[PDB]
Amino acid sequence: AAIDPEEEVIAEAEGVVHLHEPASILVVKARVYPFEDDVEVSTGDRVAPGDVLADGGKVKSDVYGRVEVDLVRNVVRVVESYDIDARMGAEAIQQLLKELDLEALEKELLEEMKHPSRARRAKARKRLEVVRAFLDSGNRPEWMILEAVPVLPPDLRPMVQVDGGRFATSDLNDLYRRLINRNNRLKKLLAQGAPEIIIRNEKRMLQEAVDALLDNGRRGAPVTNPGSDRPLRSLTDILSGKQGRFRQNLLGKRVDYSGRSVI
């Protein structure tokens, strides 16, 4: 078939067809399973050896794999490949920590505490200090990754009109905006079924948005305002240091009813 009715090749009369001169040859490791009648599994499905493919159950699959229905070659390919669940990101880790019975872990690490070489003694202790820390506290390890990220009250991240009618704004607002864009656009790339290389890229950028909000500069390049080399000041920055919350406004403040002069 082709563009316009012209240039199509129709078969002049009865005959048999041979294919020659390919663009190129693709060798896949798969199994071919021809069919005469209707096919019962559509393309994309994954299947295990012995599963019913076509023709009411006579043809079946030898291998684990995923299905490729050739309607030209009227044969059901199955490319050998597994229903493997392997994940990337915080989504993976959140599961693995959801999936930890800590009392069991404690029991297992205690058993390792009765062991020489002291090194195994030593690291089974450090692990068991975190285990016990969660057990006594009531914290679930899954809480070290966020589903909901909190938003700070606006009067603590103000945007105010200063003398000039100009506006002045706290850095957290730009660190939140970067987060919101990325979350929002990820939401849309999901609904539009984008390839996983694209979804992967945004998912990682989402992490880095969360990581600059919470503790900009901690890992990787510090996010800066456009046309400035100034790291944006993130929540960690606020808390910490000589100019941080503690040392600048909690252990010492400016005061009323005071004054200064030469002596």
Partner: protein, 210 residues
């Protein structure tokens, strides 16, 4: 914050925790019986991108053939390690080789015609049917096969052997078959009268390959 609290809870190294959080490696939650490089995939193993694709999507490879060069292999043919596929192409994978875009379609049309032929009898081989390459006759000396109608000749040459068709007006008077060892002495579009030699039959006469 060192040592990572997530890292220690999980017995994941610094590097391992980065790779899965920053989308540089996978970490498996249920291998569903996978196996890679001879060893079954164990839970909590970390696969690179290539590893993940070989286990989740299967292995494959496509090889260019030079323009105009035809393949030493056919569509749907199972291939071994290092089997050769095009004059300069050698596959590095076992599996089912699949044609991509054939530039040349050859459709062999089926034709069933009845055609005639006259030979000596001391020279003919008697049997009820002849199938390709089978010997048809052996002539002690050369015999000249003569036209048995008057007409214009429409010559149709096949790879080996020939067809001859005379006709007056546009109605075919005669359909003759010239096997191998029989070289036509007429050309297409020639007019011939009754009994002009159409072809020389020399020695062994056989039915052609096709």
């Amino acid at each position: 914050d060192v040592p990572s609290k997530i890292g220690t809870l999980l017995d994941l190294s610094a590097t391992e925790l980065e790779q899965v959080l920053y989308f540089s490696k996978y970490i498996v939650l249920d291998p569903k019986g996978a196996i890679l490089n001879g060893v079954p995939v164990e839970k909590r193993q970390l696969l690179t991108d290539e590893e993940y694709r070989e286990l989740r999507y299967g292995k494959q490879e496509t090889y260019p053939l030079p323009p105009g060069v035809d393949a030493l292999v056919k569509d749907g043919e199972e291939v071994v390690k290092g089997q050769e596929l095009a004059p300069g192409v050698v596959s590095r994978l076992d599996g089912v080789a699949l044609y991509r875009f054939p530039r040349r379609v050859r459709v062999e049309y089926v034709k069933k015609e009845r055609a005639g032929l006259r030979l000596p009898l001391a020279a003919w081989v008697e049997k009820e049917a002849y199938k390709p390459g089978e010997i048809l006759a052996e002539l002690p000396e050369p015999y000249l096969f003569r036209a048995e109608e008057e007409g214009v000749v429409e010559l149709k040459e096949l790879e080996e052997g020939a067809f001859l068709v005379l006709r007056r007006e546009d109605e075919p008077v005669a359909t003759y078959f010239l096997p191998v060892g029989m070289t036509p002495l007429v050309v297409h579009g020639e007019i011939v009268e009754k009994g002009q030699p159409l072809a020389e039959a020399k020695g062994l006469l056989r039915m052609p390959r096709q």
